[PDB]
Amino acid sequence: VLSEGEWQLVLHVWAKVEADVAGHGQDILIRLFKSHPETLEKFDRFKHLKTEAEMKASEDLKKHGVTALTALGAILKKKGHHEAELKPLAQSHATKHKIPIKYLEFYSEAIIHVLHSRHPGNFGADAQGAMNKALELFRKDIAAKYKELGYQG
Ligand code: HEM
Ligand SMILES: O=N[O-]
């Protein structure tokens, strides 16, 4: 359970993302793919991309980055009351895309990394704490759905 002040921190951070959703989404996906190349293999859409330059030049990668972070922003603005929004993503990611929960942990770390990189000296220690809690909540609630469907624990 995040506090109100922690939710406020999270959504203040998210306001930085919303000023350039495509830019953040692209930087997150590239950080993920390059830090954890197994992740790229899950995207039949993107696995042709070999180099960071090709990733950066991919307009379609940007487009998908918008789709993904738009969904995450909507979830965060629910301040934990996200059952309806989280259900479809759980089902797709477990059963269709076949994304292990561990990869969602890597995704969370890529988000944090990119926030520091884009906003140096402006992503406060309080805000990092709050964002961690928000993301941990999202992974806990997705993981329960995966467990239900026979995918994790
Ligand atoms: C915070 C984490 C994430 C969010 C909010 C998110 C959100 C979304 C959304 C909204 C879609 C399109 C709708 C859908 O198919 O359900 C999608 C598709 C997809 N996601 Fe994610 N996702 C996340 C994490 C991941 C991770 C970590 C991976 C892989 C390592 C992944 C792989 C995919 C794939 C393969 C698709 C299908 C893309 C296509 O071929 O068009 N997602 N995601
Ligand atoms: O992308 N995690 O440092």
From Swiss-Prot:
The modification Phosphothreonine is found at T67. GO terms for biological process: removal of superoxide radicals. One of its GO terms (cellular component) is extracellular exosome. One of its GO terms (molecular function) is metal ion binding. Keywords: Cytoplasm, Heme, Iron, Metal-binding, Muscle protein, Oxidoreductase, Oxygen transport, Phosphoprotein, Transport. InterPro entries: Globin (IPR000971), Globin-like_sf (IPR009050), Myoglobin (IPR002335). Belongs to the globin family. Nitrite binds at H64. It catalyses: Fe(III)-heme b-[protein] + nitric oxide + H2O = Fe(II)-heme b-[protein] + nitrite + 2 H(+); H2O2 + AH2 = A + 2 H2O. Changing G121A: In metmyoglobin. This is Myoglobin. The modification Phosphoserine is found at S3. Its EC number is 1.7.-.-, 1.11.1.-. O2 binds at H64. PROSITE patterns: GLOBIN. It is an enzyme of class 1 (oxidoreductase). It comes from the Eukaryota. The keyword Cytoplasm applies. It is found in: Cytoplasm, Sarcoplasm. Monomeric. Monomeric heme protein which primary function is to store oxygen and facilitate its diffusion within muscle tissues. Reversibly binds oxygen through a pentacoordinated heme iron and enables its timely and efficient release as needed during periods of heightened demand. Depending on the oxidative conditions of tissues and cells, and in addition to its ability to bind oxygen, it also has a nitrite reductase activity whereby it regulates the production of bioactive nitric oxide. PANTHER family: MYOGLOBIN.
